[PDB]
Amino acid sequence: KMDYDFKVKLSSERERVEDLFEYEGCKVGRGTYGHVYKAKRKDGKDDKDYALKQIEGTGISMSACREIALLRELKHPNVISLQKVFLSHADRKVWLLFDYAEHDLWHIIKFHRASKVQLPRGMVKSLLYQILDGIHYLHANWVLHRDLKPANILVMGEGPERGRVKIADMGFARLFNSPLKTFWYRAPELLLGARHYTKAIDIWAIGCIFAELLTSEPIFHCRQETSNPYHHDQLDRIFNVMGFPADKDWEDIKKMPEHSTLMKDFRRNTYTNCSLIKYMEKHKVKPDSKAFHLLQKLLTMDPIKRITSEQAMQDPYFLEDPLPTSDVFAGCQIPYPKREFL
Amino acid sequence: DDKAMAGNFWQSSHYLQWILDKQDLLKERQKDLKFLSEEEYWKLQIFFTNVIQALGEHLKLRQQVIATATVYFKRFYARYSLKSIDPVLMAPTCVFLASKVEEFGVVSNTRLIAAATSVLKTRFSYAFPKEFPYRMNHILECEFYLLELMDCCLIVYHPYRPLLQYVQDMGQEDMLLPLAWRIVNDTYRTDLCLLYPPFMIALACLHVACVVQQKDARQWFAELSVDMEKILEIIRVILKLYEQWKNFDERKEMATILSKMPKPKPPP
Numbered sequence: 001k002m003d004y005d006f007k008v009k010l011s012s013e014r015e016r017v018e019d020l021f022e023y024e025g026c027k028v029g030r031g032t033y034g035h036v037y038k039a040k041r042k043d044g045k046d047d048k049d050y051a052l053k054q055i056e057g058t059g060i061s062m063s064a065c066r067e068i069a070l071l072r073e074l075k076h077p078n079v080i081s082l083q084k085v086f087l088s089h090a091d092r093k094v095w096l097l098f099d100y101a102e103h104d105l106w107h108i109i110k111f112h113r114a115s116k117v118q119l120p121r122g123m124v125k126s127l128l129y130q131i132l133d134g135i136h137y138l139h140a141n142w143v144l145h146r147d148l149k150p151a152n153i154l155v156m157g158e159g160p161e162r163g164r165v166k167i168a169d170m171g172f173a174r175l176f177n178s179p180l181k182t183f184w185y186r187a188p189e190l191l192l193g194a195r196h197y198t199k200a201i202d203i204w205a206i207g208c209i210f211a212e213l214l215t216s217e218p219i220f221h222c223r224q225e226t227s228n229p230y231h232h233d234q235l236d237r238i239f240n241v242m243g244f245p246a247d248k249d250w251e252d253i254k255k256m257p258e259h260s261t262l263m264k265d266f267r268r269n270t271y272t273n274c275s276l277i278k279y280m281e282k283h284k285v286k287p288d289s290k291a292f293h294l295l296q297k298l299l300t301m302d303p304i305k306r307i308t309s310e311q312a313m314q315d316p317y318f319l320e321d322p323l324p325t326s327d328v329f330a331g332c333q334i335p336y337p338k339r340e341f342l
Numbered sequence: 343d344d345k346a347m348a349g350n351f352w353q354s355s356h357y358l359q360w361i362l363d364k365q366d367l368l369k370e371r372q373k374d375l376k377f378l379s380e381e382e383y384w385k386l387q388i389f390f391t392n393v394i395q396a397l398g399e400h401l402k403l404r405q406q407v408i409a410t411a412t413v414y415f416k417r418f419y420a421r422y423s424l425k426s427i428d429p430v431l432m433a434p435t436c437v438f439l440a441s442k443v444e445e446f447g448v449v450s451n452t453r454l455i456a457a458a459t460s461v462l463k464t465r466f467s468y469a470f471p472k473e474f475p476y477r478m479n480h481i482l483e484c485e486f487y488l489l490e491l492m493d494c495c496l497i498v499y500h501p502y503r504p505l506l507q508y509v510q511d512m513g514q515e516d517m518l519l520p521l522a523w524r525i526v527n528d529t530y531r532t533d534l535c536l537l538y539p540p541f542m543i544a545l546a547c548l549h550v551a552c553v554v555q556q557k558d559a560r561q562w563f564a565e566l567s568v569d570m571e572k573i574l575e576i577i578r579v580i581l582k583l584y585e586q587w588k589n590f591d592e593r594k595e596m597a598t599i600l601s602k603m604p605k606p607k608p609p610p
């Protein structure tokens with residue numbers, strides 16, 4: 001029942017993804033998010049790599065709608081930028097065009113961990129600062145990430161944006177802002193049954209990433225042990241690193257839904273010789289350093305006592321030599337390999 | 343509570359792309375004015391605003407979601423003719439798409455169609471003799487066309503949030519807020535949301551509410567740093583609306599006006 005002239009005119013004019021971009025055999029990613037490809041323009045006006053994401057599913061879901069809605073507004077150098085949306089009418093598929101990041105923290109950290117660490121001086125500091133800058137921009141606009149981890153912290157390769165952090169894969173859709181509807185980067189309050197995502201939950205994750213950048217190992221590493229938030233072995237690992245929190249350290253722990261399950265399962269005497277100081281010393285990081293004192297503020301167990309992203313960016317750590325750089329690689333050669341196609 | 347992008351209006355897509363020139367709006371309107379008069383066209387806008395309101399109320403959506411859907415509709419028919427897509431199909435599609443921008447609760451397919459069918463039958467039988475003819479596949483097709491026109495611009499700012507800040511600043515919430523809030527609702531019967539930033543619309547509504555209730559707030563309005571001639575422009579549109587309202591019998595007139603609309607031509 002639509003107007004015919006209107007319908008054919010729009011069909012004539014509508015830019016189709018397959019016509020504009022060459023991407024067959026160039027799949028660099030596959031998950032719940034959907035399909036991600038490395039892509040070049042067929043009509044050779046531009047000469048640079050693009051990330052094409054076909055969203056998983058059909059039509060416009062809540063998740064697709066939210067993601068489009070917010071990425072259309074968000075603009076910041078340390079957050080990944082939506083360039084174009086292609087709506088394929090025949091198969092009802094949504095495609096999203098982004099600039100292409102060759103690297104990410106998961107692969108960078110694995111490359112060092114494979115070696116027998118963070119070879120440019122001040123790469124760790126520069127990464128942390130840009131992560132903090134991107135999250136601060138989101139948080140200022142009341143956008144939570146809600147699933148921060150090394151895999152979705154991208155880093156740009158050779159090109160005009162060399163060694164710039166690009167935060168990606170924001171959890172744009174969660175029903176009622178609720179986690180109840182790996183666990184290595186999940187804040188203790190989420191494990192004890194917190195009903196909502198918060199800014200503080202994103203900050204704990206940055207703290208875990210910061211510990212992993214310094215040491216090359218996930219601070220709260222744990223075996224893959226569920227329709228419930230409570231995860232015993234993940235909590236056990238947090239206490240083995242951090243120690244068990246005193247009443248005075250986290251007064252509102254009693255208000256958490258799984259507190260009576262915590263008391264039932266755990267005895268504090270177990271972790272009496274455990275602390276972040278002792279853990280980081282074993283991995284050759286000095287407790288007197290400004291890096292450590294900032295890490296300890298990021299990894300505070302009580303969410304209300306956890307430092308914000310703004311306050312973290314103001315830390316004297318970033319005023320100490322060496323200073324953060326725009327290019328995290330600091331003009332040095334990039335040893336990390338390119339993305340292999342699937 | 344809907345805080346996403348709240349303080350970003352001046353760098354938003356709403357401001358940079360969907361605040362239109364009035365003369366450009368009138369120029370695109372001339373193609374539909376060959377069939378309808380200027381008066382008839384404004385009455386259609388009022389009618390379909392009430393249809394979107396009635397759908398929203400039926401689905402238990404909060405006012406802000408209903409407003410966003412109203413804007414999506416207005417934005418579509420600012421660019422294109424009424425013949426291009428049937429506005430009876432577009433209205434529930436706008437409500438459906440607006441509801442998916444929120445993450446607190448979801449509107450189902452079967453529930454949408456049921457609401458569209460029920461509202462037009464119980465509340466708008468003066469305009470529509472026949473039942474809602476569209477199934478869900480038509481909503482899902484229309485959604486794709488709507489999203490494409492809007493250039494994927496989905497976050498819409500409204501006067502309710504600034505209004506709330508202004509009345510709280512006066513210390514006159516119980517006195518002025520209910521009346522000011524309904525006047526904001528009434529401004530969606532007009533083009534105001536395509537022409538002015540929301541905070542200006544909220545100030546105009548709050549001025550009218552003060553005049554109606556005989557509350558001296560001249561000093562408070564003087565303390566603001568804003569273009570007062572732009573507000574007086576908005577005030578005159580609001581006062582004009584209530585004189586249109588008075589002289590318009592929606593129920594008596596809307597069947598005839600709906601038959602004068604240009605119709606979508608079928609394929610060859």
Ligand SMILES: Nc1n[nH]c2ccc(C(=O)N3CCCC[C@H]3c3ccc(F)cc3)cc12
Pocket residue numbers: 028029030033036051053080098099100101102104151152153154168169
């Ligand atoms: N490689 C990319 N450049 N620009 C992008 C914009 C988005 C995406 C993207 O969807 N994902 C999936 C989840 C977030 C991490 C990212 C990704 C990370 C590693 C990987 F091996 C494949 C994909 C990728 C790029």
